[PDB]
C-alpha cells in the first residue's frame, strides 16, 4: 500500500516518512526530496475571487494566495495546495460550473 | 499553525523505502514427556 500510495502524491508520503515536511517527486523507482521552507501564518492573503477574466468558463480550482517569506519582505503570488502547502505556479485551473 | 513553501526537488537527494524484513517463526516449543510420579519428602 505504501508503494502504491506514493505514486499518487509523493509529497504527503515523503513528508510523513522522512519526518520533516519535504517536497518530493519520483525518479522512476526512487524519491527525490527537498526540504520545504516555513512561512509565518500571519503573512498570507487569500484573494477574494477564484475566476479568471481572460479564460471565460475556467477558474482556479484552489484559492489564489499572496505571501512574504520574511515578516517584511516583498509580496509574492502563489496558489494554496493541500495541507498548507503553497505552490509557486498559478496553473491548477478547472472548467468551472 | 504554519504555512510551507516547497521547491521543486532536484535529483540531488534520493531515498528509498526499506524492504520487507524477515522475522522468525514461533519458538519450537518444549518437548514434554508425560509420566507417573511419586514425590517423597
Amino acid at each position: 500500500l505504501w508503494n502504491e500510495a506514493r505514486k499518487l502524491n509523493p509529497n504527503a508520503i515523503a513528508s510523513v516518512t522522512v519526518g520533516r515536511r519535504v517536497s518530493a517527486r519520483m525518479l522512476g523507482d526512487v524519491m527525490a526530496v527537498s526540504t520545504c521552507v516555513p512561512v509565518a501564518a500571519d503573512n498570507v492573503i487569500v484573494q477574494n475571487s477564484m475566476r479568471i477574466s481572460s479564460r471565460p468558463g475556467a477558474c482556479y480550482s484552489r484559492p489564489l494566495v499572496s505571501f512574504r517569506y520574511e515578516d517584511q519582505g516583498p509580496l509574492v503570488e502563489g496558489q494554496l495546495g493541500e495541507n498548507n502547502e503553497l505552490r509557486l505556479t498559478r496553473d491548477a485551473i478547472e472548467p468551472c460550473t | 499553525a504554519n504555512f510551507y513553501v516547497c521547491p521543486p526537488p532536484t535529483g540531488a537527494t534520493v531515498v528509498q523505502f526499506e524492504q520487507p524484513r524477515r522475522c522468525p517463526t514461533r519458538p519450537e516449543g518444549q518437548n514434554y514427556t508425560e509420566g507417573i510420579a511419586v514425590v517423597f519428602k
Partner: antibody, heavy 119, light 108 residues
Framework: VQLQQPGAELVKPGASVKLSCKAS????????IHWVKQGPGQGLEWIGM????????HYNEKFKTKATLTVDKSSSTAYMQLSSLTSEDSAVCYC?????????????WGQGTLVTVSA | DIQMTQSSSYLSESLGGRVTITCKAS??????LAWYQQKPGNAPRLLIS???SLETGVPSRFSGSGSGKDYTLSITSLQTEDVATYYC?????????FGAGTKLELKR
C-alpha cells in the same frame, strides 16, 4: 562586505552565457541575493531574486527563460545562466544583498558586470 | 500591479540651490518606499529606506517624506558632486519596481 563581478563579458550574441558574483564579508548563506539589469542610461530593472540558503528562485515575470539563477554555497558564489542573448542585452547587471529584513533596500552591491553581448 | 510614476525626468539647479523631487505610486503602499541615487560611474547609493527615513552617508541636505500615494525628496545645498539619477523604489510586492530616474544636474 563586498561582491566581486567580472568587469565585462565580450560574448557573441546567440549562444547563452554565464555570470558570477563572489560574496565577501557577511554570511553568504543567511541573506537574500537579488539581481538587477540596466542598460546604458536606462531605468534599472530588477531581474530576479534568490535565497542562497534554500535555493528558492523568484524571477521577474519577463525573466523565466531569459535568465536562470543558481547558487554555490561552497564558494559563496551566485550565478546567472543567461539564455537567448541579444545585442541589446549588453548592460550592467548588479548582484545585491538585502538585510535579514527581506525588504531588500539593497545596501551593499558589487561593481556589477557590464556584459557586452557582441562579436 | 504596482507602477512608479516619477515626476521629473531631470532637475538642474545652480550651486547651493534647493530642489524637491517627488513621485507617485499606482497603488497604496503604506510608506514602504525607498530613494536611491546613482552616478554613472558607481553602483547606486541609498538615501531613504522607508518613505521617511534618512540613514548614514546622507546628510540633512537630503530629506525624504511622503504618505499614501505621493512621496518626495527635498534636496538642500545642491553641489557639483550630486549630479546623478535619482530613483524611487518600492518594496511592497513582487515584482519590485524602480523609478524611471530624475537627472539631478547643475545650472552650468
Amino acid at each position: 562586505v563586498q561582491l566581486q563581478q567580472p568587469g565585462a563579458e565580450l560574448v557573441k550574441p546567440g549562444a547563452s552565457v554565464k555570470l558570477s558574483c563572489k560574496a565577501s564579508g557577511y554570511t553568504f548563506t543567511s541573506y537574500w541575493i537579488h539581481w538587477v539589469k540596466q542598460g546604458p542610461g536606462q531605468g534599472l530593472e530588477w531581474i530576479g531574486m534568490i535565497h542562497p540558503n534554500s535555493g528558492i528562485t523568484h524571477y521577474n515575470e519577463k525573466f523565466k527563460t531569459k535568465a536562470t539563477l543558481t547558487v554555490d554555497k561552497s564558494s559563496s558564489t551566485a550565478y546567472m545562466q543567461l539564455s537567448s542573448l541579444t545585442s541589446e542585452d549588453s548592460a550592467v547587471c548588479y548582484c545585491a544583498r538585502g538585510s535579514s529584513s527581506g525588504s531588500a533596500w539593497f545596501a551593499y552591491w558589487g561593481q556589477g558586470t557590464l556584459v557586452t553581448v557582441s562579436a | 500591479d504596482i507602477q512608479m510614476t516619477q515626476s521629473s525626468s531631470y532637475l538642474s539647479e545652480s550651486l547651493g540651490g534647493r530642489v524637491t523631487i517627488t513621485c507617485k505610486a499606482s497603488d497604496h503602499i503604506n510608506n514602504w518606499l525607498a530613494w536611491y541615487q546613482q552616478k554613472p560611474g558607481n553602483a547606486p547609493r541609498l538615501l531613504i529606506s522607508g518613505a521617511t527615513s534618512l540613514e548614514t552617508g546622507v546628510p540633512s541636505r537630503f530629506s525624504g517624506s511622503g504618505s499614501g500615494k505621493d512621496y518626495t525628496l527635498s534636496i538642500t545645498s545642491l553641489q557639483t558632486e550630486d549630479v546623478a539619477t535619482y530613483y524611487c523604489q518600492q518594496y511592497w510586492s513582487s515584482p519590485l519596481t524602480f523609478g524611471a530616474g530624475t537627472k539631478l544636474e547643475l545650472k552650468r
